[PDB]
Amino acid sequence: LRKSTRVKVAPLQYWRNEKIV
Amino acid sequence: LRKSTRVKVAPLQYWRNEKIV
Amino acid sequence: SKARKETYSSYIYKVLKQTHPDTGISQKSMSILNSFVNDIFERIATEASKLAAYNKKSTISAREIQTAVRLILPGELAKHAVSEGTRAVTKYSSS
Amino acid sequence: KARKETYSSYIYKVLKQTHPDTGISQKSMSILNSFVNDIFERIATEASKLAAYNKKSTISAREIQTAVRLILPGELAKHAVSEGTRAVTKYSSS
Amino acid sequence: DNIQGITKPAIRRLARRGGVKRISGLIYEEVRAVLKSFLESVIRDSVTYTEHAKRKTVTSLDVVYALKRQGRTLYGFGG
Amino acid sequence: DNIQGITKPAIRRLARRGGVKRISGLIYEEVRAVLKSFLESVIRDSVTYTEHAKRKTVTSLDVVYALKRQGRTLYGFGG
Amino acid sequence: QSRSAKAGLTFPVGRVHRLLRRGNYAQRIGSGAPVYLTAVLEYLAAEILELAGNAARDNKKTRIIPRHLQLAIRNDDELNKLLGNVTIAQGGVLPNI
Amino acid sequence: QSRSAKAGLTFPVGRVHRLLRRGNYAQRIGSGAPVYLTAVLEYLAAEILELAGNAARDNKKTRIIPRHLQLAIRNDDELNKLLGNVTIAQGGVLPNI
Amino acid sequence: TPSELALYEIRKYQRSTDLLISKIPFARLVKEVTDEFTTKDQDLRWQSMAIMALQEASEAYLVGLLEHTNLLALHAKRITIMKKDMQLARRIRGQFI
Amino acid sequence: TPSELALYEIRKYQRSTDLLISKIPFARLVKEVTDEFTTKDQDLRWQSMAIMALQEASEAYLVGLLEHTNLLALHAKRITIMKKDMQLARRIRGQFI
DNA sequence: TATCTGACACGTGCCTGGAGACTAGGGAGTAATCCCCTTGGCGGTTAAAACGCGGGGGACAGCGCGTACGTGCGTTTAAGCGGTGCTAGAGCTGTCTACGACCAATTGAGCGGCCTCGGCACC
DNA sequence: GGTGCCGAGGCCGCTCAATTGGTCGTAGACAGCTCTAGCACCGCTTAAACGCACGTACGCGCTGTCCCCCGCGTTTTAACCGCCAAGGGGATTACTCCCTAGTCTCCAGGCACGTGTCAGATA
């Protein structure tokens, strides 16, 4: 009856310096 | 009048599996 | 006489039945969730105590807990965390 | 207008007892003060956690000795516990 | 005489789990060495923990406490 | 364009102090990126610290606490 | 009347208050701190439990095993950053592709 | 008569006692803990001071600078293990071949 | 083809989550280790869950180190892992220092 | 001789222990960084001690990262370092996650 | 070698912190008992660890090159000393009203011990 | 396809703690004032960053040469399940002893503020 509302994305590789955009 | 008592050794390379001997 | 153990299995089962009415749970998963929530509580309490002692104060309030959960949890999670905390505290203070 | 306490005089006296003619700067003094404060804080929290583990409510010499043995390395802790026991048996002689 | 309980089938299985396609002949010795070092460290910590409480039996609580103090928290075994 | 303040001779001197003999042409960008990321994290922690205390001047104690909480203890400035 | 029902939460508040009192954290404990901590813990538990339930339902399985918990934890960057040094018993590892 | 002179220690005893009593560590405090902690801290300080003085005398210097402290720290295996994640201000790195 | 069987067994071992080391040799090894750190006038017993937890932690650490050294070997434009790769991995990991 | 000049510069910069980054550009950069962290109507002011401490910490971190990158480049049987080595060092380090 | 500069080292004032004595009350050490678990061995049994041998895919050394890199010099820009002025904000101090700990009663709350029931591999 | 094994899941009591109400010591929010380092600007000059030209040197691709993990086949030592059995010891409960927080009173100890003074930079 309850669901989450936050954004969920795949784990990012910090060593390549990705951007969320 | 105060002198050290414990033994002193150089920093050992733990990555090469060095022993205290 | 066998002493009673203080666990959080009942509340976890309650929120599970609230979220998923059909999905069950095992015992190892319950122990893992209990250890996780205990570690999170300990971390938050220690951070709040240290941050309150930094300001030479002897009283822990909602501001210290809010700053602790904002410092520990990442920003994306801390936003919803402090939102739910403010909602709960204002619902409690409303009555 | 509010004075603070530091481990300056004691460290200076220890240095004078060790080396008769050797100076020191403010940076080295602050570094040593921060180091001794961090070590004291670490030992204190370790002893507190060890006492809370066994459902205890007191901090005796056994807990501090175990915390020192658990924090310091082999020879360092071996000498530290010896010095601590010596100081304890010297202070207890009343 | 006792470190030989980790014969190369187990190390090969662990490497396949880790995603290794080719293993040399000088990897098993270093694997055993690092495993023995980690075991010595964790066992020293657990023995100190169980000796502080004046006990002669090592429980899982002391093990998980030593693992948490080292910096590797373990879940699923209580504590 | 403040990130351009870190000139190439500065990075070259840092690499020489670290022990690098030859440097390519793509190291400066990654160095600036990792420096910006570390600065962002530390400054975010310091601003959180100085904002909890309802103050408006960031002191050295806040930066020291932010460095200590992240696992990098700094000596010579306080504590 | 329990404070948990007044606050609209599910996790207990009196137990958290007693722990904060006899936890050797401070000399005085506020009134709005236990409810805040309880709400935060309940939110985190509900989030991780919903993630684990979704991961378990993805494999058309009813029971929840530590493998599903590991799959749900390692697939979220926020939870991976929060839980980066902990290990899950019998959780396995993530596949290469 | 001070308690520091009774046990033969240069570092204070009542000061660290009050520090650990007002630090929210436990409900009660023993009697042999402050003297033990004082002795341990004094031993550590004496060791590091002797090492720094030797490092400064090796370079025919009359005063101790953070460079000598960094050298004495990096030239010992146990001190490097105890302070692995600790940096020294104005200390720099040590030379190597 | 050997590469096909290699990838097949890699996927099979990554899909599973159980232990890959026998229990009796590990128990004998941990008993010898805990006897090396204990004096002769006493002996320490062991439970059942503690050995399992220690074994799980050891396998997790070994899998992590193996993945790191495999990445390091793949960086050097080769597939076969060498001892120097694991050495440099353990050195750059910063642990045990 | 380029190798002689490189070795001389390495020795000279390893013997020195002073600052290596300019103060005004670093201050402007950290100010521009903290500008977009807070809100717009109000800002914050910085002190010299905090700025210089942050600068020293960042310098130490960058020196460590460059040393690790140099080791990784030496592992591949080459002298010139590349961005791939720094990326691999950051990945193996495991920080920021 | 004569002269100016700055940080290190030694002398006062004293007040807030350190030292000494009586009380009592809860906390840690000491005995005593029981039953869950552990160490040690035996019968078996097949799953899995051990060892010999072929050949092929993979690791390593040598050679040619050409494209990125460090060296060298003319030149422009922004770091830094140093004043000058402004000021918002750090820091110390007096009031007291509201928030928190403590004590007696108690009742509805959460856990240990039955009993049931469905999922699954089995013969 | 019928059936026994086993792990979740719902009752039945039952006991130790969250609630409630009243009292009193206390603490930091607020308002007030004072003094300082951060901020911005100015003048200027010399250390240091920049762009352009070029020899060079080594990372890389290609080739060839060894070579040692790997799979297949045969033989075997110990892993484990079930059963046996004694006892060392952790958990639990009483019990008498004493360590220290509390309070009060009295007094020495190190920090902030003067006052030199010699190594080092400058001429």
Interface residue ranges in chain H relative to chain I, Cβ cutoff 8 Å: 80-81, 84
Contact present, H64 and D89 (Cβ < 8 Å):
no
Which chain H residue lies closest to B20 (C-alpha atoms)? H77
Query: Domain span at residue J20?
Result: 2-93
Contact A14 J88 (CB under 8 A): no
Nearest 5 degrees, angle CA I5-CA I8-CA I12?
Answer: 135
Contact present, G81 and A12 (Cβ < 8 Å):
no
Contact positions of strand L to protein Cβ (< 7 A): 7-9, 16-20, 27-28, 37-39, 48-50, 57-60, 68-71, 78-80, 88-93, 99-101, 109-112, 119
Contact G50 A3 (CB under 8 A): yes
Rounded to a whole number, what is the distance in angstroms from the first to the last CA of chain B? 31
CA distance J42 to F51: 12
CA distance E4 to G24: 48
CA distance I85 to J8: 31
Q: Is D57 helix (H, G, I), strand (E, B) or coil?
A: coil
CA distance J66 to F28: 11
Contact positions of strand K to protein Cβ (< 7 A): 7-9, 17-20, 27-29, 37-39, 48-50, 57-60, 68-71, 78-80, 88-93, 99-101, 109-113
**J17 touches H at CB < 8 Å:** yes
Contact present, F10 and F30 (Cβ < 8 Å):
no
User: Which residue from C33, C34, E72, C9 is spatially nearest to G66, judged by alpha carbons?
Assistant: C33
- Give, in Å, how far the C1' of K94 lies from the CA of G31: 29
User: Which residue from I69, H49, E40 is spatially nearest to B20, judged by alpha carbons?
Assistant: E40
What's this structure's resolution in Å?
Answer: 3.3
- Give, in Å, how far the C1' of K72 lies from the CA of J2: 13
Q: What is the largest CA-CA distance in chain D?
A: 50
Contact present, G40 and C44 (Cβ < 8 Å):
yes
Q: How many domains does chain D have?
A: 1
User: Which residue from I69, I68, A15 is spatially nearest to J85, judged by alpha carbons?
Assistant: A15
Distances (CA, A) of A17 to E28, G77, G89, J82: 36, 14, 31, 16
Which I positions 11-50 lie with beta carbon below 8 A of chain E? 13-14, 16, 20-22, 24-26, 28-30, 32-34, 36-38, 42-47, 49-50
| Angle, helices I49-75/J83-93, rounded to nearest 10 degrees | 180
User: Which residue from G39, J34, H56, C56 is spatially nearest to F42, judged by alpha carbons?
Assistant: J34
Distances (CA, A) of H80 to F7, F75, J34, J61: 33, 15, 34, 17
Contact present, J92 and I86 (Cβ < 8 Å):
no
Number of Cβ within a 10 Å radius of residue A9: 10
Own/partner pairs, I44-49, CB within 8 angstroms, 24+ separation? I44/E47, I44/E50, I44/E56, I44/E57, I44/E58, I45/E56, I45/E57, I45/E58, I46/E57, I46/E58, I47/E57, I47/E58, I47/E59, I47/E60, I49/E59, I49/E60, I49/E77
Q: Is D23 helix (H, G, I), strand (E, B) or coil?
A: strand
Contact present, I49 and E46 (Cβ < 8 Å):
no
Q: What is the largest CA-CA distance in chain A?
A: 39
Q: 3-state DSSP: chain B helix, strand, coil percent, rounded to 5?
A: 15, 0, 85
**Which domains are seen in chain F, by residue range?**
2-69 (1.10.20.10)
CA distance B1 to D18: 7
Structure tokens at H8: 């033969």
Between β-strands C59-60 and D23-24, what pairing exists: parallel, antiparallel or unpaired?
Answer: unpaired
Q: Which residues contact D66 (CB under 8 A, 6 or more apart)?
A: D47, D50, E48, E52
H or E element, residue G14 = helix G14-21
Q: Where are the alpha helices (DSSP H) in C20-74?
A: 27-54, 62-72
Exposed, middle or buried by CB within 10 Å (0-12, 13-18, 19+), for D4? exposed
Which A positions 1-21 lie with beta carbon below 8 A of chain G? 2-4, 6, 8-12
Q: Where are the alpha helices (DSSP H) in D1-94?
A: 8-18, 26-53, 61-71, 74-91
Number of Cβ within a 10 Å radius of residue I95: 15
- Give, in Å, how far the C1' of L88 lies from the CA of I44: 11
Distances (CA, A) of G53 to C75, G65, J13, J82: 24, 10, 57, 44
CA distance I5 to H73: 52
Exposed, middle or buried by CB within 10 Å (0-12, 13-18, 19+), for A7? exposed
Distances (CA, A) of F2 to H61, J24, J46: 42, 11, 17
CA distance H16 to H12: 7
Q: Which nucleotide has the shortest C1'-to-CA distance from I77?
A: K59
Q: What is the CATH number of the domain that holds J42?
A: 1.10.20.10
Count of residues making up chain E? 79
Q: Which nucleotide has the shortest C1'-to-CA distance from F22?
A: K69
Q: Please compute, for residue G81, the number of CA atoms within 13 A of its CA located in the half-sphere on the CB side.
A: 17
Q: Rounded to 5 degrees, what are φ and ψ at E74?
A: -120, 135
Q: Which nucleotide has the shortest C1'-to-CA distance from F12?
A: K70
C88 belongs to a structural domain? yes
CA distance H48 to H42: 10
C79 belongs to a structural domain? yes
Q: Which residues on G lie below 8 Å from H24 (Cβ)?
A: 24-27
Structure tokens at J97: 């996650």
Residues facing E58 on adjacent strands: I46
Distances (CA, A) of I71 to C87, E75, F34, I76, I81: 47, 27, 22, 9, 9
Q: What is the CATH number of the domain that holds D81?
A: 1.10.20.10
**I56 touches G at CB < 8 Å:** yes
Strand residue runs (E) in chain E: 57-58, 74-75
| Angle, helices D74-91/H33-58, rounded to nearest 10 degrees | 130
**J66 touches F at CB < 8 Å:** yes
Number of Cβ within a 10 Å radius of residue D59: 27
H or E element, residue F23 = strand F22-23
CA distance I66 to I64: 5
Distances (CA, A) of H60 to D20, D22, H63, H92: 15, 11, 9, 20
E/A Cβ contact: 3+ pairs below 8 Å: no
Q: Characterize G42-80 residue by residue with b for buried, 16 or more Cβ atoms within 10 angstroms of its Cβ, and e for exposed.
A: bbbbbbbbbbbbbbbeeeeeeebbbbbbbbbbbbbbbbe
User: Which residue from E40, E37, E36, E61 is spatially nearest to E50, judged by alpha carbons?
Assistant: E61
Q: Which residues contact B18 (CB under 8 A, 6 or more apart)?
A: B12
User: Which residue from J29, F36, D87, E16 is spatially nearest to H13, judged by alpha carbons?
Assistant: D87
Q: Which nucleotide has the shortest C1'-to-CA distance from J47?
A: L38
Contact H90 J17 (CB under 8 A): yes
**H79 touches F at CB < 8 Å:** no
> DSSP labels for H4-17?
HHHTT-SS-SHHHH
DSSP state for residue G88 in the 8-state scheme: E
User: Which residue from J82, J37, J49 is spatially nearest to F36, judged by alpha carbons?
Assistant: J37
Size of interface D-H (CB pairs under 8 A): 160
User: Which residue from D4, F56, G29 is spatially nearest to C57, judged by alpha carbons?
Assistant: G29
What is the Cα G1 distance to its own chain's centre?
26
CA distance J66 to J70: 6
CA distance H55 to H91: 13
Between β-strands H63-64 and D23-24, what pairing exists: parallel, antiparallel or unpaired?
Answer: parallel
Q: Which residues on G lie below 8 Å from I57 (Cβ)?
A: 87
- Give, in Å, how far the C1' of K115 lies from the CA of C34: 27
Q: Which residues contact G62 (CB under 8 A, 6 or more apart)?
A: C22, C23, C24, G56
Nearest 5 degrees, angle CA I9-CA I12-CA I13?
Answer: 85
Tokens 């959780």 — which residue? Answer: G91
Contact present, D12 and D24 (Cβ < 8 Å):
yes
Q: How many domains does chain J have?
A: 1
**E75 touches C at CB < 8 Å:** yes
I/D Cβ contact: 3+ pairs below 8 Å: no
- Give, in Å, how far the C1' of L5 lies from the CA of G75: 36
Q: Which residues on E lie below 8 Å from D63 (Cβ)?
A: 52
D94 belongs to a structural domain? yes
User: Which residue from J20, J28, I94, I57 is spatially nearest to H85, judged by alpha carbons?
Assistant: I94
What letter represents residue B5's amino acid?
T
Q: Which residues on D lie below 8 Å from H66 (Cβ)?
A: 25, 27-28, 31
Contact present, H89 and F67 (Cβ < 8 Å):
no
Q: Where are the alpha helices (DSSP H) in chain I?
A: 2-15, 23-36, 49-75, 83-93
Structure tokens at H17: 């006692």
Q: Rounded to 5 degrees, what are φ and ψ at E25?
A: -90, -15
Strand residue runs (E) in H5-95: 63-64, 86-88
Q: Which residues contact D25 (CB under 8 A, 6 or more apart)?
A: H63, H64, H65, H66
Q: Which nucleotide has the shortest C1'-to-CA distance from J2?
A: K70
CA distance I97 to H78: 9
Q: Which residues contact I90 (CB under 8 A, 6 or more apart)?
A: B14, B15, E34, I65, I96
CA distance J87 to J93: 10
Q: Which residues on J lie below 8 Å from G81 (Cβ)?
A: 97
What is the Cα C25 distance to its own chain's centre?
21
Between β-strands G87-88 and E74-75, what pairing exists: parallel, antiparallel or unpaired?
Answer: parallel
Query: Domain span at residue C85?
Result: 57-95
Structure tokens at G87: 């290990």
